Amino acid sequence: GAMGSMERASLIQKAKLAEQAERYEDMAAFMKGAVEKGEELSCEERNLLSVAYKNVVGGQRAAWRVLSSIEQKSNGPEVREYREKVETELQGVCDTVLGLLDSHLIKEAGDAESRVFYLKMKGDYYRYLAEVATGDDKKRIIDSARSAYQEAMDISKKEMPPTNPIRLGLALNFSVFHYEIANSPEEAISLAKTTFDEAMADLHTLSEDSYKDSTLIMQLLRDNLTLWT
Amino acid sequence: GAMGSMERASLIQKAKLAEQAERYEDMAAFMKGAVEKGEELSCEERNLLSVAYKNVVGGQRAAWRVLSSIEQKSNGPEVREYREKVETELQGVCDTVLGLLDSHLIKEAGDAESRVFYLKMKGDYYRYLAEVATGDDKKRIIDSARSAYQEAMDISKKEMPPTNPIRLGLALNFSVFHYEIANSPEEAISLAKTTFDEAMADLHTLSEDSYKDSTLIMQLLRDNLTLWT
Amino acid sequence: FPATV
Amino acid sequence: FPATV
Ligand SMILES: *CC(=O)NCC1CCN(C(=O)C2(Oc3ccccc3)CCCC2)CC1
Ligand SMILES: *CC(=O)NCC1CCN(C(=O)C2(Oc3ccccc3)CCCC2)CC1
Ligand SMILES: [Mg+2]
Ligand SMILES: [Mg+2]
Ligand SMILES: [Mg+2]
Ligand SMILES: [Mg+2]
């Protein structure tokens, strides 16, 4: 690939620099490069991968929502055309991420944390595809997201404590999936509440730093619950 | 060019959509396309061109400053390499803008407003080149910026009222050039103060809408003067 | 627009 | 960082 000639450590270093410069497209390219070196990623490296693509796709989703809103309120072909271009670009980014997961992140992920993180990611990028899909494709995409999230949940509940930030993050996102995507607000609320409640009871085992990581995500669960109830 | 197949009106419409979606790279591409249709730009179209490239180059300058700061404080080659890539990209954008001005915006600009706007732009993109240049190249780039700004000022003082937002904007930017680039803070302060004072005296001739445009830029002159004195 | 991570 | 337009 385009980053194939750069040292693995240099790609990671440059991803960190790109993050500091808020150059998220660059950061994603560097992290794609790093994945494509063929070695398993560390916890820090998974964070960098996730931050990079989440920010790129975040920007695309924000742009798409703006354009769709203008398209809706406008009901020439320029708005629909431009919305479709952004849509295609977003689809391309999701396909790239799913590709990375397929080649070969998930298949080599043997530990709970790595496997859950990647399965969570699979769920997230199908969820983004679902936001812009229609018809039968949408139904299949939605079910694919649900399958990935559910497998992640199953592993997380068996192998990780309820304060694990990856477990918490997964539940947060899967809860949003239920509410916004699958139109299952009771499942969304139940998942968020139970996740919060189980984590609360395990907080006493955490160092100050881990306590901060876990309670941050718990706040986001509360924030969403506040919106939904 | 890449946008050569799209209708002129559609390019402009899509630039406006891109602005709403904060897709400034897209906006710049659409406006480049529009310029390359060969017709003179309107006041609104010049605004769209300027907003698009100012935002793209703004992001690059912000990123470059972050990276340079990290490079400075770090005194491997990754920081210098990445800073140089961003630098080259910024240089490429400035070259594109200067190219548009050369092919053929300035030469066809016969009215005061169009010619001053484009000469101001020439000054701005040499100023951005100057921020990242060194040695003899830097001195020549700086002098090129100064020449463009000075010709713009000469036309503006002869042909435009002192409340004209293009005249005001020019003076604001040329003042910043003097202070930050040419190390002439007395010239910077004098230009900003005199511009503010001459505009103040002409405000009584403006409609409410023009009053708002002019006083906005006058506030920016005051803001800079506050920093400098 | 709900929180995700 | 001073204002420009
Ligand atoms: C060991 C490992 O793989 N760690 C991954 C990191 C876990 C902490 N973390 C976070 O808490 C935040 O993002 C995030 C949480 C859960 C899943 C995915 C991402 C970082 C800022 C918000 C929470 C980063 C990833
Ligand atoms: C007739 C014509 O060419 N008009 C150009 C516009 C003049 C108003 N304007 C502005 O006031 C702002 O930007 C700007 C001012 C001066 C020079 C260049 C840009 C818009 C927001 C800040 C002032 C837009 C351009
Ligand atoms: Mg489509
Ligand atoms: Mg359930
Ligand atoms: Mg250089
Ligand atoms: Mg003078």
Write the CB contacts of B72 (distance below 8 Å, at least 6 apart in sequence). Answer: none
Ramachandran bin of B183, using left for φ above 0, alpha for ψ from -120 to 50, beta for the remaining angles = left
> Can you list the alpha helix ranges (DSSP code H) found in chain A?
8-20, 24-35, 43-73, 78-100, 106-108, 112-132, 135-159, 165-176, 185-202, 208-228
B113 lines ligand 2 (CB under 6 A): yes
Choosing from A46, A47, A125 the residue with most ligand 1 atoms within 8 A of its CB, the one to mutate for a pocket test is A47
- Asked if B223's CB is within 8 angstroms of D4's CB, the reply is no
Q: CB contacts < 8 Å between A and C, how many?
A: 22
CA of B118 to the centre of ligand 2 (A): 12
**Under an 8 A CB cutoff, do A23 and B86 touch?**
yes
The answer to whether A149 and A170 are in contact (CB under 8 A) is yes
- The residue whose CA has the least distance to atom 4 of ligand 1 is A43
The residues spanned by each domain of chain A are 8-228
Please state, in angstroms and rounded to a whole number, the distance separating the CA atoms of residues A102 and A107.
Answer: 7
Dump the DSSP string for A29-55: HHHHHHHTT-SPPPHHHHHHHHHHHHH
Closest residue of A to C5, CA-based?
A169
**What 8-state DSSP symbol labels residue A207?**
-
Under an 8 A CB cutoff, do D2 and B227 touch? yes
Contact A173 C5 (CB under 8 A): yes
Resolution of the structure, angstroms: 1.8
The answer to whether A131 contacts chain C (CB < 8 Å) is no
Distance of CA B98 to CAs A44, A156, B116, B140, B141, Å? 42, 56, 15, 15, 12
Query: Quick check: A155 and A116 in contact, CB under 8 A?
Result: yes
B124 lines ligand 2 (CB under 6 A): no
Quick one: tokens of A222?
Answer: 């509360």
Task: Catalogue the long-range contacts made by B129-137 (C-beta closer than 8 Å, 24 or more residues apart).
Answer: B129/B91, B129/B94, B130/B181, B131/B61, B131/B64, B131/B181, B132/B64, B132/B87, B132/B90, B132/B91
> How many A from CA of A165 to the centre of ligand 1?
6
Contact C5, A169 (CB under 8 A): yes
CB atoms within 10 A of CB A176: 23
Q: Token pair of B161, please?
A: 């009222």
Q: How far is the CA of A191 from the centre of ligand 4 (A)?
A: 7
Q: What's the fold here for domain B8-228?
A: Delta-Endotoxin; domain 1 (1.20.190)
- Residue listed under structure tokens 């001005």: B101
